[PDB]
Design a protein around this ligand. Structure first.
Ligand code: NA
Lengths: 278, 278, 278
């Protein structure tokens, strides 16, 4: 059970985002069609961008489909400026039932943000779930609101976070303070790439390393700050990459699913303040 | 009787669009002043554009007037990019009580869209009703939501529509599939110019011509998809030309009325995908 | 007591603006955080601009602070185009408890608008209250909605206002009709610089001068049209400079307060239609 505080002037039903066990984090928003057969394109992109910026995570559920990747691409071009990759606009994320991770690849993704190692950082992730036929076990895409996590820290946790600084390598190198300001809108956020030799933490005594990681995890994975998404066919999800961190829940048996991801630039494009250019 | 689902954060009263016999189609929105003496200009244009894009037809009723055409013009310049004609921004549509259509001109206008034969197609029609003193009989401006009509088609009607293709001539020539995608936002729409020798329909066997026209008319003129507007002095109407088709109800005795119409470009201007340039 | 008509699709609590004695003018809007620890930056600026344009005065109260002037500046750069002064973006308005106005400076500010004597006129004032520790006596920043005042005028007051015209000097000279149209959105507004030899009023017989001033004051200082703001620490106020006039209530004992003001250009920058260039 929960209360419902939103009424839009748009032809949609809004309500708080809740995960499949009824948990309701301190961010996110569910949008559902206000007319039979409504397509996502019928809603004004400018309006979605606004909601995505303040709710940080939008779940549009039960809308009619983009027929293909080209259709999604054209939609995104109208939505904002697409951040192009060598493959174009759409990253295809297709998984088969029970397909092994060639024995070497890990079975979970820790929290991080897109564009860490890029010249420019995208503001939004746009995910279209093409197909998610069966119901899977684990493997949900996870999102955490870094402002929510910041409200959970106690005095000393926070004092520790503020001295801290991450150094990352994958070769490309990137460095960010753990506690950052939103690069356009000023509010306090976290930039943190979570480890599962390539992840160092400066500004603190290296014995406190364990404490930093344990506290950041406690806050970011807390029910107030953390949402795990169970994909459904034709979900359209829009995520605020500048405010959230994202990752993926561990899976034993992975199920069939097909996602498509487009990145949208900040307005105007955001130069990566964290990339090492020296 | 009907229910009222909208509360704005704007100083306006919103409610579902309903025609004068209480019918409530699956689109449209009535906006009314939230303060004594409110002028239409007090509402933010960007916000109206958003509503116009998702509700497709906005009726602003009971707001203070633009004093003249120049005032309307300046307003529209702020609203978006005006699509200029040789006469400028404002088409004057003035009718006198009982004035004959020189004996040759027809007394109704079938459904169609603006910019069929133009190099660029406008996104919005902005109508200001300068004056509509008496109450008339027939002659209402009609609008149809092509997505609504698409939800009404059965399996075979739809199968037929999807093969179909219109060829139009007035000399200028234009061709469009009957079932189209919105040229910016992807969702399914209809492009159809309705006949009352200059209207051919390809992709189907010419004996099915009768069936196409009868089914398209059944769906577009259905109460769920169709709205007929009784003009009142100082109505401001904003119509989504990319999604709707429009026309005019038959009249016996035409009454006095004065309308002004401005066209607003898509963002950016939309090149007519249907004009024959060969 | 009062009724509450707003529900946002944004994570905020909206309600009508009311002064500290419970008066509720015909404009203004109070916005309050929808989440613990919310910062003003979490709300989309484009959305605030829209509300500021239709409600004319926004009071964001109880949000987390900009840490300093630089932070406020960066925020405003994202908000719109900052109108820069020789000092930069932020005017510092710091007052000390009981500090004398060097014996010569007046202890109240009559109603006027920003940019009277400038080449370009800003659309918005953005005020951040850095600190307002004690509770003061008098000295509140005042705002008046000129459309509200226009609804208060009777037939002859209005007839008089419409003939009237202000001529101002501080050297810089500026002239405006008392009754003006909004320079972008057309609706009727007032432009009036209120006197406490440098303020002349044309278009009327100079014996009617007294009547003009008395009627304009009656309407602009009327509870329906007038709001006086008691500053609190971290208030963020956004004012529609194109529609309102502003000033300051008389004070006996002035209290400690620190304000910061940024100006935001119209879109695009507005050339001052009233500056004498001849
Ligand atoms: Na809005």
């Amino acid at each position: 059970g929960h209360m419902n505080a939103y009424l839009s002037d748009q032809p949609v039903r809004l309500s708080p985002l809740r995960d499949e066990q009824g948990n309701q984090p301190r961010f996110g928003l569910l949008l559902e069609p206000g007319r039979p057969g409504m397509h996502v394109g019928e809603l004004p992109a400018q309006w979605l961008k606004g909601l995505a910026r303040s709710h940080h995570l939008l779940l549009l559920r039960g809308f009619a489909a983009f027929a293909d990747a080209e259709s999604l691409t054209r939609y995104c071009h109208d939505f904002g400026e697409v951040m192009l990759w060598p493959f174009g606009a759409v990253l295809e994320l297709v998984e088969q039932e029970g397909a092994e991770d060639h024995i070497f690849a890990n079975n979970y993704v820790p929290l991080h943000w897109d564009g860490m190692y890029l010249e420019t950082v995208p503001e939004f992730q746009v995910f279209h779930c093409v197909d998610a036929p069966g119901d899977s076990d684990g493997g949900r895409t996870t999102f955490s609101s870094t402002p929510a996590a910041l409200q959970l820290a106690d005095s000393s946790e926070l004092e520790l976070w503020r001295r801290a600084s991450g150094r990352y390598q994958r070769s490309s190198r990137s460095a960010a303070p753990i506690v950052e300001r939103h690069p356009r809108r000023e509010f306090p956020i976290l930039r943190f790439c979570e480890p599962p030799s390539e992840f160092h933490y400066d500004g603190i005594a290296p014995e406190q390393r364990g404490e930093l990681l344990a506290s950041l995890r406690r806050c970011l994975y807390h029910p107030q700050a953390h949402y795990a998404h169970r994909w459904r066919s034709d979900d359209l999800v829009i995520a605020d990459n500048l405010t959230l961190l994202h990752g993926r829940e561990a899976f034993a048996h992975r199920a069939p699913r097909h996602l498509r991801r487009v990145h949208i630039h900040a307005e105007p494009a955001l130069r990566n303040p964290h990339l090492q250019r020296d």
